């Protein structure tokens, strides 16, 4: 129950899959270059989900060409089209910040079975 729920309900998106920290996801992001509009996929592990309602955000971590990259999105952002979940992770906490210090094999997350 929130004071401003009657405003936010208009912008809440309905096509959001259920996902948790530790899941591997594919975030299809709209990107503009010049006048043409294309979709760029950001594949990585969800490391955190914070907030609520129309202001809830989630962060995805990828390793790209030897450099760690983190990307944070409003869950209900209209700049995303599809979020696709790929694997469920086995994690023991809500926030996976410890992954920021780990590389390679040790950075791997266990899957749900």
């Amino acid at each position: 129950m929130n004071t401003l729920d009657f405003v936010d309900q208009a912008s809440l998106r309905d096509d959001i899959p259920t996902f948790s920290p530790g899941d591997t996801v594919n975030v299809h992001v709209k990107v503009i270059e010049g006048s043409k509009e294309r979709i760029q996929v950001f594949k990585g592990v969800v490391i955190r989900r914070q907030g609520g309602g129309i202001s809830e955000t989630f962060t995805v971590r990828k390793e790209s060409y030897g450099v760690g990259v983190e990307r944070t999105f409003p869950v209900h952002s209209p700049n995303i089209d599809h979020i696709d979940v790929l694997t469920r992770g086995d994690v023991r906490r809500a926030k996976l910040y410890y992954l920021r210090e780990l590389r390679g094999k040790k950075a791997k997350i266990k899957e749900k079975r």
Binding site: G68, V69, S77
Partner: peptide, 21 residues
Amino acid sequence: VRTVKERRRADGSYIKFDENA
């Protein structure tokens, strides 16, 4: 070209790198 401090984008998204380059 890369910063460790997260940078805000017009869409309300953020970008963050592990190193400054």
